[PDB]
RNA sequence: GGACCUGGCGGUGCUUCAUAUCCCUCUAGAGGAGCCUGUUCUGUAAUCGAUAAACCCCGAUCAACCUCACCACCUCUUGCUCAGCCUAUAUACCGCCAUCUUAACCCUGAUGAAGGCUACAAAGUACGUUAGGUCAAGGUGUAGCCCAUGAGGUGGCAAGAAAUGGGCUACAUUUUCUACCCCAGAAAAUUUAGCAGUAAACUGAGAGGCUUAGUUGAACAGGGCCCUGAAGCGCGUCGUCAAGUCGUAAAGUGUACUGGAAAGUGCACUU
């Protein structure tokens, strides 16, 4: 599976129109090797449905697609990265489903089919969440999702979905 | 050696470059052929070539420097500069031999003017 | 000796002789005069608008002559061998006289502009002829991926676009010179620092990727290996490129003894596989211009080059059409398609009354100087030779 | 473990000016018409290809029923003369052009690595290279075919179309013709130079498109750079999974809390 090369920081500065390197207000993991490590630690993703948050440049996206996922739902807030993610989707047809919106309000409960819903007491329902978000957004997100587990709703309508 | 590691006595005639021929050096051969109106320049050139080859093969390792070939009327003077390594008897033999061969080969009174030197007169080192 | 009088006959497959004239015989690979895309020429002139005076003509001429007459770097063993003889017969001065002083060219901004102005059109023509070889002989090939080692101004990228733009989707351009990368980007963007690229999917890198996992459909190196400072660097680069080559490896150099020697070294290196257990086990053969894999019969004292006529970019000094003389070798993965491989005409064909001179590199590994005439060889083969030209294939069998 | 030293970045940017070539400005001319050439497409079995080899007998010239070249059919044979071809090769040499390369001494630091300047002066002095072009004002060889790469005969071949590149002619009223050599009468967009006796216009002499001698004689003449020159300041002194057959170019120190933590806030300190 041949995919486009990862964008270097030069192309990223050009893409965000900053024209310099000290004005990003953001840190990117542009090391496909550490992202390989993270996706390995997420478990066995073969034919899994991955809800990936905070896609960004797409190191995590490339790592996950390298694993034989079935559907990879991407939720990006910025529109300057949608072009790169569309190129990624075209390079790997049928696997990358990109969406625009906030992860704090996006409704994952309708995203995937209802044939994946396992019971709560059974094994985790083959649906995974992977996320490299800004730390200013991951804490409210985990509080919200902890409430969802307490109520057995939201991303956990499919069962005991695992998060990384 | 090594690639960036890279980055002989000579007499007067050898030292000075061709663009000094009328500035510092002279002309070895002197004749009227190349003057304006005169003829047979090519014949004189061919004669000069033969003289130089013959002399360099008849005095091997003796000529310290290049010949000077002068021509006045039908006379043909070879002024050569030789070393003091060969015996004078052999020099006299070769002078007589060369004079007679060149006189009968060019149908003119050729004459030869050895000047011996102790060793090559080195001008500089290049 | 692939032309025995009265024995060798034209190779009639697909019913060639019956359905189509001789001027279109399948070995005709000659390309019409090459014109650069208008976008490329306009970008070049726009980028050179800053300074295109009488100095630039002299600079272009000097750079062109320097590159054409440049030799391969002198290996240290060669210095030792020559120094031994010079001592046997001061020695350093004699070496300085009798050895070529090979220098690295540092392509800063000014030299990048001069190199563009001096070589863009020539490189485009040479690479276009090399690519037309593949296109003509394998029209089914639809590459999706191209890499260009030493992509100076993007001439390979533009030629590959002009030929396979309906399928190519990624152009990796490797060039350690930041000024040259900047110039290539400006050229792709219409000669303006800000704009929209004409070719989509071009990626620029300053370091050569070294990984056999990532493998390209076409890997090109045009006038790039002559800039490497040593045979060890050339060997490692060629090994890396062959490892990353998926279908075709196109090497192009100047049509000189130095370029031909460099290319034949690369050809031997690729053909004599040394890797014990490579990731890609497919063997390699010579798709063009060689009809064999045996040693070149012209590496002894001559060279082997091919000419492509082209129209230079209009400038204050470019008025008449020019000719680009280049050496090439295309190495393809797999095995030869069939056993009917045809002689290559490696020199201008001389047409004279009722006979034709062709210098052929035969499949058996030998050169043959053939004087083809109708009565001796056959009317059809004589007409095929009459219409053929330099760098074409002669369809002869048995 | 402590102290110190050399450094090296084949480095990175900027600053000011000398900044001439090169710019930019500025000045003066160079697109239409008719033919001839370059490229492309289309078309033919084929060449709208050439005249030490036609024609013409103003210049030039197109196809000429010249002749060579191409295409389709044939013929000749020991013949021209131990025949005949300009067919190749300078990718044979020579020649002619062109390309590229071409140490010692003396002091200082306690006699350590190490260092050595002040002018109203404080240790410093001494040829090769090339698958190059040229077989027309030139040679020395080598190869080819010899029922044909030789000699003839019968027909055909004589292209079409565009866009652009180039060349030759005439292109006027500040002109043209006569007399005169200047007071008469009749007619009707890129590019090339600039920089002065230059551009432009007009005459003569030569060797037989090239070399020399003259006459008349302009317009513009301001700003800034690339690049060496002259110096100055600063900066700067990469990462990762198993090493590359890896990727790439006001500020601080503590402590406490931190659930909108790519670090923030609170309290106390330092320069
Ligand atoms: C001058 S370009 C040759 C012309 C160019 N290929 C074209 O198509 O016109 C060759 C470039 O290769 C670069 N180069 C040399 N070694 C390299 C390497 N090992 N990796 C990447 N680039 C290299 C040099 O900097 C040089 O600029
Ligand atoms: S085509 Fe023949 S002469 Fe040319 S490089 Fe190949 S083997 Fe050598
Ligand atoms: Mg001829
Ligand atoms: Mg004709
Ligand atoms: Mg003839
Ligand atoms: Mg030659
Ligand atoms: Mg807080
Ligand atoms: Mg604090």
Give the nucleotide with minimal C1' distance to the Cα of C301. D131
- Cβ A33 vs Cβ A60: under 8 Å: no
Strand D closer than 7 Å to the CB of C62? yes
Chain C residues with beta carbon closer than 8 angstroms to that of B7? 96, 101
Q: Which of C250, C285, C240 has its CA nearest to residue C160? A: C250
- Cβ C108 vs Cβ C179: under 8 Å: yes
- Cβ C98 vs Cβ C298: under 8 Å: no
Q: Is C96 close to B3, i.e. CB distance below 8 A?
A: no
CB pairs under 8 A, 24+ apart, for A89-94? A91/A1, A91/A2, A91/A3, A91/A4, A92/A1, A92/A3, A92/A65
* Helix residue spans in C138-245 (DSSP H): 155-164, 178-188, 231-244
User: How many A from CA of C343 to the centre of ligand 3?
Assistant: 25
Strand partners, C163: none
Residue A4 lies in a domain: no
Q: Which of A40, A76, A43 has its CA nearest to residue A160? A: A43
CA-C107 nearest atom, ligand 1: 27
Nucleotides of D under 7 A from a protein CB: 10, 21-23, 38-41, 44-47, 68-73, 86-89, 91, 99-102, 127-131, 144-145, 147-150, 165-166, 190-192, 226-227, 239-242, 244-249, 259-262
Provide the number of structural domains found in chain A: 1
- On the 0-12 / 13-18 / 19+ scale of CB atoms within 10 A, C168 is buried
User: How many A from CA of A54 to the centre of ligand 7?
Assistant: 23
Find out whether C290 is annotated in a ligand binding site.
yes
Select the residue of B1, B7, B8 nearest C83 (Cβ to Cβ): B1
Task: Compute the C-alpha angle C104/C107/C108, nearest 5°.
Answer: 130
Domain around A141:
9-164
3-state class (DSSP) for residue C186: helix
- Cβ B110 vs Cβ B47: under 8 Å: no
Element (H, E) at C326: strand C322-333
The Cα C20–Cα C268 span in angstroms is 38
The Cα C132–Cα C124 span in angstroms is 12
Q: How far is CA C106 from CA C44, C178, C352, in A?
A: 21, 11, 48
Who's near B73: CB < 8 A, 6+ residues apart?
none
Q: Flag whether residue C96 sits within 8 Å of chain B, measured between CB atoms.
A: yes
Residue A1 lies in a domain: no
**In whole angstroms, how large is the CA radius of gyration of chain C?**
22
Question: In this structure, are strands C171-174 and C245-254 parallel, antiparallel, or unpaired?
Answer: unpaired
Q: How far is CA C198 from CA A19, B64, C375, in A?
A: 22, 73, 55
Residue A132 lies in a domain: yes
The Cα A57–Cα A55 span in angstroms is 6
Distance A89 CA to D261 C1' (A): 33
- Cβ A64 vs Cβ A45: under 8 Å: yes
The Cα A91–Cα A76 span in angstroms is 18
The Cα A75–Cα A55 span in angstroms is 7
Residue A108 lies in a domain: yes
The Cα A131–Cα A50 span in angstroms is 10
The Cα B52–Cα B69 span in angstroms is 9
Q: How was this structure determined?
A: cryo-EM
At A15, list the tokens.
């893409």
The Cα C391–Cα B115 span in angstroms is 65
CA dihedral A18, A24, A28, A31 (to 10 degrees): 50
Residue A118 lies in a domain: yes
Strand partners, C311: C35
Phi, psi dihedrals of residue C97, rounded to the nearest 5°: -75, -45
At C170, list the tokens.
């990624």
Return the HEC string of chain A. CCCCCCCCHHHHHHHHCCCCCCCCCCCCCCCHHHHHHHHHHCCCCCCCEEEEECCCCCHHHHHHHHCCCCEEEEEECCCCCHHHHHHHHHHCCCCEEEEECCCCCCCHHHCCCHHHCCCCCCCCCCEEEEECCCHHHHHHHHHHHHHHHHHCCHHHHCCCCEEC
- Cβ C361 vs Cβ C297: under 8 Å: yes
Q: Which of C204, C236, C243, C206 has its CA nearest to residue C331? A: C243
Who's near B115: CB < 8 A, 6+ residues apart?
B79, B80, B81, B82
CA dihedral C271, C273, C277, C282 (to 10 degrees): 10
User: How many A from CA of C152 to the centre of ligand 4?
Assistant: 47
Q: What is the number of residues in chain A?
A: 164
Strand D closer than 7 Å to the CB of C316? yes
At B91, list the tokens.
């020099």
| Domain harbouring A152, CATH code | 3.40.50.150
At A74, list the tokens.
């991407």
CA dihedral A152, A156, A159, A164 (to 10 degrees): -130
- Cβ C201 vs Cβ C216: under 8 Å: no
The Cα B83–Cα B73 span in angstroms is 30
3-state class (DSSP) for residue C374: helix
Residue A3 lies in a domain: no
DSSP letter string, C15-46: THHHHS-GGG-TT--PPPPEE--HHHHHHHHH
The Cα A103–Cα A138 span in angstroms is 10
Element (H, E) at C370: strand C367-372
* Helix residue spans in C207-317 (DSSP H): 231-244, 257-271
**What are the b/e assignments for C292-330, b being 16+ CB within 10 Å?**
bbeebbbbeeebbbbbbebbbbebeeeeeebebbbbbbb
CB neighbours of residue C132 within 10 Å: 17
Strand D closer than 7 Å to the CB of C321? yes
Task: Compute the C-alpha angle A44/A114/A84, nearest 5°.
Answer: 60
Q: Which of C343, C348, C268 has its CA nearest to residue C306? A: C348
- Cβ C59 vs Cβ C317: under 8 Å: no
At C310, list the tokens.
């082209």
Q: How far is CA C378 from CA B111, C382, C388, C392, in A?
A: 71, 6, 15, 19
Element (H, E) at B88: helix B88-106
Residue A126 lies in a domain: yes
Distance C311 CA to D36 C1' (A): 22
Residue A134 lies in a domain: yes
């Amino acid at each position: 599976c041949r995919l486009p090369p990862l964008p270097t920081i030069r192309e990223i500065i050009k893409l965000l129109r900053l024209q310099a390197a000290k004005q990003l207000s953001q840190n990117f993991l542009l090391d496909l090797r550490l992202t390989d490590k993270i996706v390995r630690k997420a478990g066995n993703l073969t034919n899994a449905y991955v809800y990936e948050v905070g896609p960004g440049p797409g190191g995590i996206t490339r790592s996950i697609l390298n694993a034989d996922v079935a559907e990879l739902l991407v939720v990006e807030k910025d529109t300057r990265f949608i072009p790169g993610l569309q190129m990624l989707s075209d390079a790997a047809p049928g696997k990358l489903r990109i969406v625009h919106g906030d992860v704090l309000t996006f409704k994952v409960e309708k995203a995937f089919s209802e044939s994946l819903k396992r019971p709560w007491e059974d094994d985790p329902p083959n649906v995974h969440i992977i996320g490299n978000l800004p730390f200013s957004v991951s804490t409210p997100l985990i509080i919200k999702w902890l409430e969802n587990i307490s109520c057995r709703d939201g991303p956990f309508v499919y069962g005991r979905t695992q998060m990384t | 050696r090594e690639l960036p590691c890279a980055w002989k006595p000579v007499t007067y005639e050898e030292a000075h470059a061709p663009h000094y021929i009328a500035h510092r050096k002279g002309w070895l051969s002197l004749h009227t052929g190349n003057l304006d109106g005169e003829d047979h320049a090519a014949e004189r050139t061919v004669e000069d070539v033969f003289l130089r080859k013959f002399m360099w093969g008849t005095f091997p390792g003796c000529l310290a420097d290049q010949l000077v070939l002068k021509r006045r009327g039908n006379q043909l003077e070879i002024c050569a500069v030789v070393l003091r390594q060969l015996s004078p008897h052999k020099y006299y033999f070769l002078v007589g031999y060369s004079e007679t061969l060149l006189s009968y080969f060019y149908k003119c009174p050729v004459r030869l003017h050895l000047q011996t030197v102790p060793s090559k007169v080195v001008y500089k080192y290049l | 000796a692939a032309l025995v009088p009265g024995v060798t006959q034209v190779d009639n497959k697909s019913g060639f002789l019956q359905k189509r004239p001789h001027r279109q015989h399948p070995g005709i690979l000659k390309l019409p005069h090459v014109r650069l895309p208008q976008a490329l020429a306009n970008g070049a002139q726009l980028l050179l608008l800053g300074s295109a005076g009488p100095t630039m003509e002299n600079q272009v001429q000097t750079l062109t002559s320097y590159l054409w007459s440049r030799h391969l770097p002198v290996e240290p063993e060669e210095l030792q061998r020559r120094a031994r003889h010079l001592e046997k017969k001061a020695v350093l001065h004699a070496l300085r006289k009798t050895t070529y002083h090979w220098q690295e060219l540092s392509y800063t901004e000014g030299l990048s502009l001069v190199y563009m102005a001096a070589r863009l059109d020539g490189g485009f023509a040479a690479v276009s002829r090399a690519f037309h070889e593949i296109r003509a002989r394998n029209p089914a090939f639809q590459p999706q991926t191209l890499m260009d080692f030493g992509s100076g101004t993007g001439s390979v990228t533009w030629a590959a676009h002009s030929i396979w733009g309906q399928s190519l989707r990624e152009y990796m351009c490797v060039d350690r010179s930041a000024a040259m990368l900047v110039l290539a980007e400006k050229l792709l963007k219409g000669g303006s620092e800000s704009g929209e690229p004409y070719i989509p999917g071009v990626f620029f890198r300053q370091f050569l990727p070294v990984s056999p996992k990532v493998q390209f459909d076409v890997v090109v190196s045009a006038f790039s290996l002559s800039e490497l400072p040593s045979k060890a660097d050339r060997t490692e680069v060629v090994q890396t490129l062959w490892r990353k080559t998926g279908h075709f490896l196109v090497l192009v150099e100047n049509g000189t003894k130095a370029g031909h020697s460099l290319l034949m070294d690369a050809r031997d290196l690729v053909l004599k596989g040394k890797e014990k257990s490579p990731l890609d086990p497919r063997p390699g053969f010579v798709f063009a211009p060689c009809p064999h894999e045996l040693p070149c019969p012209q590496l002894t004292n001559l060279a082997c080059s091919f000419s492509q006529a082209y129209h230079p970019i209009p400038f204050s000094w470019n008025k008449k059409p020019k000719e680009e003389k280049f050496s090439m070798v295309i190495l393809a993965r797999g095995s030869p398609e069939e056993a009917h491989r045809w002689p290559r005409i490696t020199q201008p064909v001389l047409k004279r009354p009722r006979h034709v001179h062709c210098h052929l590199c035969c499949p058996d590994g030998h050169m043959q100087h053939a004087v083809l005439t109708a009565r001796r060889h056959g009317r059809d083969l004589y007409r095929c030779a009459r219409v053929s030209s330099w760098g074409d294939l002669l369809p002869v069998l048995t």
